[PDB]
């Protein structure tokens, strides 16, 4: 699950 | 003597970091001339559902921006989309803008990360682009917009702006054209990266540095042709070797030729409880160019 | 997520590097205010044993060439300061930061700005080892490269590079000119004390690994700190002396130090069978302060 | 053997 930082 | 993963000095890049806030979102931008570049998800309303970035840009209140360099706030003139970046025209030129270029890097290339938070540089470390287009970084939320860069002849070559972390802790940015590395999406969705393969030519530069530093216990007289190696590599998580002519300078001043190192690679793929320059496993993070500068300065 | 050994940004130090030439010797100096600090072996003659007091008595001030880039500084005086020369110059460095001197202790992290010909070439984090050497990367010409920490805008200078030990350990002096570890700035056959792993740093790394999902190595056994300490001085590891710095980690992870010490012993006997967060399982280069900074930003 | 750098 991609985490936008 | 010694080999360390090191960064080029960061001062010319520190002057270009700004803080970009919009709503509940805050990350970093890069201020060159009169434009600030930053990840476009700084205008995204949430990060659980999918994001419609063209819509988010259409409802943008330019005044709800807050872009600052230290305590110097920049007035926003206009905002347009550049792939996965925003290009933000601001009302002031950065007088400290260095000579600079953009370049998109390929797997196996090294560059420098200036890790930033709240628009200020916090750390700097070297990375190497993996075959699945991720980097082994250290980033937490707020790090997006941290730039990746190389310095050659006083020109800063900008190659990376941080974007996101994948499901595993791999880190993905885009280039400065706004093209995400590896085609990953800046969406908070299930995406899994491909398997990484060790960049063999880098593993070779590391083993030569190991030889130059007196590490030889792993070295064999046993020797394997590039051909039978590539056949073994594709079943063992490594890349194929093509140009061996980049190792000519290393073979010449160690007396050790690639085929011997290639055969060492297969045996080491396990160190038997021993170490090589402090490592207990093969590393592909050092390029021949990095190794040459650290052993000889040229 | 992620753990990387990084340097603090180097901009504020980069402008304090000068080239110091005397005779056939060239190395780096640290220009603060109207003084340039530099290793005293720049005024030594051969490659024999050096009487630095005589060297200084037969010195002519006009034989110094000290330059910041292409700007040359006039030498007003030279005084000896332990293993350093304090060179008074006729120009104030207008880019002098707020600064202090501090002498670091084994286990402490700081930043090396590797310099050649009076210009910064690279930057990397290091850790003072128990034998007062650092595991760095330096070649001839690197002496005078500063070690520093940045704390709340004040640069704390803790190291100027001096020499490489016959094995390739790196040794500097503090800015008062006291050599770390008491080694001599003499081209002689001195050998380093035994390098041991700094256990308290290993504990910080193992906690970092737990926070980042690495648990395969976690022992179910426990060992008392003092019992482990008796084993450590027979197994190449320092003693554990401070434990309160780990209470925050023990609380977040649920794992106390005693389980980690037992894990450390069990990793010693299958040393190399598996990596931890990508690193060799017994990495001692990360302090608790670095781990806190990278996991939580505080 | 120490090397002064």
Automatic annotation (TrEMBL), chain C:
<feature type="domain" description="Peptidase C30">
    <location>
        <begin position="1"/>
        <end position="298"/>
    </location>
</feature>
<comment type="similarity">
    <text>Belongs to the coronaviruses polyprotein 1ab family.</text>
</comment>
<protein>
    <recommendedName>
        <fullName>ORF1ab polyprotein</fullName>
    </recommendedName>
</protein>
<comment type="function">
    <text>Forms a primer, NSP9-pU, which is utilized by the polymerase for the initiation of RNA chains. Interacts with ribosome signal recognition particle RNA (SRP). Together with NSP8, suppress protein integration into the cell membrane, thereby disrupting host immune defenses.</text>
</comment>
<comment type="function">
    <text>RNA-directed RNA polymerase that catalyzes the transcription of viral genomic and subgenomic RNAs. Acts in complex with nsp7 and nsp8 to transcribe both the minus and positive strands of genomic RNA. The kinase-like NiRAN domain of NSP12 attaches one or more nucleotides to the amino terminus of NSP9, forming a covalent RNA-protein intermediate that serves as transcription/replication primer.</text>
</comment>
């Amino acid at each position: 699950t991609v985490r936008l930082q | 003597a010694g080999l360390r993963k090191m960064a080029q000095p960061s001062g010319v890049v520190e002057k270009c970091i700004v803080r970009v806030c919009y709503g509940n979102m805050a990350l970093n931008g890069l201020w060159l001339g009169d434009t600030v570049m930053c990840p476009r998800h700084v205008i995204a309303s949430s990060t659980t559902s999918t994001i419609d970035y063209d819509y988010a840009l259409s409802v943008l209140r330019l005044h709800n921006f807050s872009i600052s360099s230290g305590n110097v706030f920049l007035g926003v003139v206009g905002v347009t989309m550049r792939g996965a970046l925003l290009q933000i025209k601001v009302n002031q030129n950065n007088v400290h803008t260095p000579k600079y270029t953009y370049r998109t890097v390929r797997p196996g290339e090294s560059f420098n990360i200036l890790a930033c938070y709240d628009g200020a540089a916090a750390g700097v470390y070297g990375v190497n682009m993996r075959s699945n287009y991720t980097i082994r970084g250290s980033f937490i939320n707020g790090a997006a917009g941290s730039p990746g860069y190389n310095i050659n002849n006083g020109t800063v070559e900008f190659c990376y702006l941080h974007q996101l972390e994948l499901g595993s802790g791999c880190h993905v940015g885009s280039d400065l054209d706004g093209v995400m590395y590896g085609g990953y999406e800046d969406q908070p969705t299930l995406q899994v990266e491909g398997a990484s393969s060790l960049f063999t030519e880098n593993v070779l530069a590391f083993l030569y540095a190991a030889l130059i530093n007196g590490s030889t216990w792993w070295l064999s007289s046993s020797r394997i042709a590039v051909d039978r190696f590539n056949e073994w590599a594709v079943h063992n998580g490594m890349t194929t070797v093509v140009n061996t002519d980049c190792f000519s300078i290393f073979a010449a001043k160690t007396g050790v030729d690639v085929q011997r190192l290639l055969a060492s690679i297969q045996s080491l793929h396990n160190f038997g409880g021993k170490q090589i320059l402090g490592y207990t496993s093969l590393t592909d993070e050092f390029t021949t160019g990095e190794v040459i500068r650290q052993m000889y300065g040229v």
